[PDB]
């Protein structure tokens, strides 16, 4: 009658006898009963589906994170059979959200394999691990595809691809562009006094990465090359394992050369469409979360016309339809080369025509705008122009030209150097953030020449100049990190 209080308690909690649990808890029974299997009564109160039994055990002194022989916390069984009112109660008394069993799977993975809808949104509110792996190397994205879910294979990916963008265009970080291929690094390494070998291209990239620790909060993304990822450092650690260890995202150059058109006047395109579905499944496992899609655009007499705009409107949208289905964040870079001669009234007119067709095709190919990045070029006059302009007139027409086409759903908007000077590119960037206009998106730096110009002339080509080349990179990393916030005063520069 009154013997074996732990054996009789599991029987009432398994079937659902609500008139028997209160009697046992009112006499003097143990709430944390451990039998031969060590299964606490909290598991049977949440696996079958009885919210009334859970509300009684939690008001006495039951362990919410009680692990059994299989290491399965009661949070796993609460979101297994398909119950929402039970999971919301266990998350209020401080439960282990990152629970790991024998394999090492968080409770978030069980909500996608079974078929939960509103239960997934509850675990993502308190704070769950997005890129949670285990002994097999499968996250919450490579499993729901083979199952056959519609509200889980397309909605869950909208949060993983967007959370990475917050750690790149953050107010204080930046993007380090350094994807010099074999047909571009040999030009800069020719007039200095060096050659183009495999050792020179590998040692040059290690100087900008493995340096002082004062550039971690200033660099959020590093752009590399496909050959760079297949190379290691002199210490013994790979390149992607160093950038992510200090607070950065590893990139890779995927676009190839250019292909001239027919019947035009110098209009070219960007090569890198074939074989895209086979490269995104491999670069994601290495540690690459984004890329760099650079195009070639110029302003002449009639270029661009009604052909280069329509052609580039579909290429920029087709690339973002495959990388989002794996784990690569597409970055559109509508770079316009300021060639010829033009003023601010003409350069801004061409910018509003090209950017108007970018987001037009993105709303048709199902492109998540809240998880992509844009890298537009500045509105600067040509080099052959005779009329000079101040730093305030350039930043005035730059922000206005972006608010007409770029939607506020973009996480961050970057810029380029424009082929100008190293110091001039940093002064014009500060005037953009100080413009008296409400900017819904964020601004940062993403130069591909000004961030490494001082680290090349003073480097020479020896081995004893390693401490002298990394010193100039610290001054350039702190100068561009303050121009994106509005607190940058040019003192002696």
């Amino acid at each position: 009658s009154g013997s074996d209080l732990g054996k009789k308690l599991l029987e009432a909690a398994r079937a659902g006898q609500d008139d028997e649990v209160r009697i046992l808890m009112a006499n003097g029974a143990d709430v944390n009963a451990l039998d031969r299997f060590g299964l606490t009564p909290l598991h049977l109160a949440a696996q079958r589906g009885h919210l009334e039994i859970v509300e009684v055990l939690l008001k006495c002194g039951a362990d919410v994170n009680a692990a059994d022989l299989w290491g399965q916390t009661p949070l796993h069984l609460a979101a297994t059979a398909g119950h929402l009112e039970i999971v919301e109660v266990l998350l209020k008394y401080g439960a282990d959200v990152n629970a790991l069993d024998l394999i090492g799977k968080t409770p978030l993975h069980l909500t996608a394999i079974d078929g939960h809808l509103e239960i997934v949104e509850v675990l993502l509110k308190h704070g769950a691990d997005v890129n949670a792996q285990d002994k097999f190397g499968k996250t919450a994205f490579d499993i729901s595809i083979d199952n056959g879910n519609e509200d889980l294979a397309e909605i869950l990916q909208k949060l993983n691809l967007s959370d990475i963008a917050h750690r790149i265009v953050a107010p204080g970080k930046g993007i380090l562009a350094a994807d010099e291929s074999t047909g571009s690094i040999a030009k800069r390494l020719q007039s200095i006094g060096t050659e183009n070998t495999e050792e020179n291209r590998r040692f040059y990239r290690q100087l900008l990465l493995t340096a002082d620790d004062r550039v971690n909060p200033c660099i959020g993304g590093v752009i590399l090359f496909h050959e760079t990822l297949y190379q290691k450092a002199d210490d013994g650690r790979p390149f992607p394992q160093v950038i992510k260890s200090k607070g950065g995202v590893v990139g890779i150059k995927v676009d190839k050369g250019v292909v001239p058109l027919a019947g035009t006047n110098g209009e070219t395109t960007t090569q890198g469409l074939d074989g895209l579905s086979e490269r995104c499944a491999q670069y994601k496992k290495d540690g690459a979360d984004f890329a760099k899609w650079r195009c070639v655009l110029k302003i002449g007499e009639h270029t661009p016309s009604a052909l280069a705009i329509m052609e580039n409107a579909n290429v920029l949208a087709r690339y973002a339809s495959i990388c989002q289905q794996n784990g690569i964040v597409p970055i559109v870079e509508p770079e316009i080369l300021p060639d010829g001669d033009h003023d601010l009234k003409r350069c801004q007119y061409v910018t509003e025509k090209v950017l108007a067709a970018v987001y037009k095709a993105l709303s048709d190919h199902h492109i998540y705008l809240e998880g992509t990045l844009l890298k537009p070029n500045m509105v600067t006059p040509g080099h052959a122009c005779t009329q000079k302009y101040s730093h305030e007139e350039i930043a005035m027409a730059t922000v206005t030209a972006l608010r007409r086409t770029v939607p506020p759903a973009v996480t961050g908007v970057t810029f380029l150097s424009g082929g100008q000077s190293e110091e001039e590119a940093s002064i014009n960037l500060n005037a953009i953030n100080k413009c008296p206009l409400l900017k819904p998106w964020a601004l940062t730096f993403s130069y591909g020449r000004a961030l490494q110009a001082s680290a090349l002339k003073a480097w020479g080509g020896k081995k004893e100049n390693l401490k002298a080349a990394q010193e100039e990179y610290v001054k350039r990393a702190l100068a561009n990190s303050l121009a994106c916030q509005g607190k940058y005063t040019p003192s002696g520069q």
Partner: protein, 226 residues
């Protein structure tokens, strides 16, 4: 099917194993639970004899294998739930490279409310310094694929799948399986086509136990037609 409605909820599973190799008599008696709706296996094998000569990772895909998670478009290609609650005789003959061979005979059936299955493991001609008997393997079991074919001769399903095991030297061991499931009753028996499933097992220990055991946690999930 009419037998698929009986697997709704938690059904207790009783493991009754009794093998004999090289004159060594051993018996394994375990118990646990299962789930066929979402595909969850929770068992606790307890060695009643003590020092088991045969290793543990080589005796994982033995009993159960009936609470799998089948998709909504693969309910007509079932065989484990078609002979219920009549049952079926599951006979296997596991082969190896250059060592020995196994011979099991399972009778997956219900006796009222608890799944009771008996396996008479046989087979002779083994070694005293190989992977079997001698403790040389590790304590881990990775994922493997199980291919299910079809047969229309003796009214059954000829399941053929090849798995692998790990060791502590660097070699690769390959095994061969020839499962032949024969039903007992003469009721409605379905004929599935060709499809493969998945296996996500997990082995661990238990500090609250002095005798030998094996905490198995397998996750079976079906895929599609190959």
């Amino acid at each position: 099917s009419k037998g698929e409605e009986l697997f709704t909820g938690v059904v207790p599973i009783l493991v009754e194993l009794d093998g004999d190799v090289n004159g060594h008599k051993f018996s394994v008696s375990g118990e646990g639970e299962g789930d066929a709706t979402y595909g969850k296996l929770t068992l606790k094998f307890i060695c009643t004899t003590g020092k088991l000569p045969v290793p543990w990772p080589t005796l994982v895909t033995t009993l159960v294998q009936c609470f799998s998670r089948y998709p909504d478009h693969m309910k007509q290609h079932d065989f484990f739930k078609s002979a219920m609650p009549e049952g079926y005789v599951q006979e296997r003959t596991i082969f190896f490279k250059d060592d020995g061979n196994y011979k099991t005979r399972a009778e997956v059936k219900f006796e009222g409310d608890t799944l009771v299955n008996r396996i008479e493991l046989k087979g002779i001609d083994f070694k005293e310094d190989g992977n079997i008997l001698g403790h040389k393997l590790e304590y881990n079991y990775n994922s493997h694929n199980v291919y299910i074919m079809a047969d229309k001769q003796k009214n059954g399903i000829k399941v053929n799948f090849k798995i692998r095991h790990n060791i502590e030297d660097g070699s690769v061991q390959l095994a061969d399986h020839y499962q032949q499931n024969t039903p007992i009753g003469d009721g409605p028996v379905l004929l599935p086509d060709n499809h493969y499933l998945s296996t996500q097992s997990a082995l661990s220990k238990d500090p609250n136990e002095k005798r030998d055991h094996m905490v198995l946690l397998e996750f079976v999930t079906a895929a599609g037609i190959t």
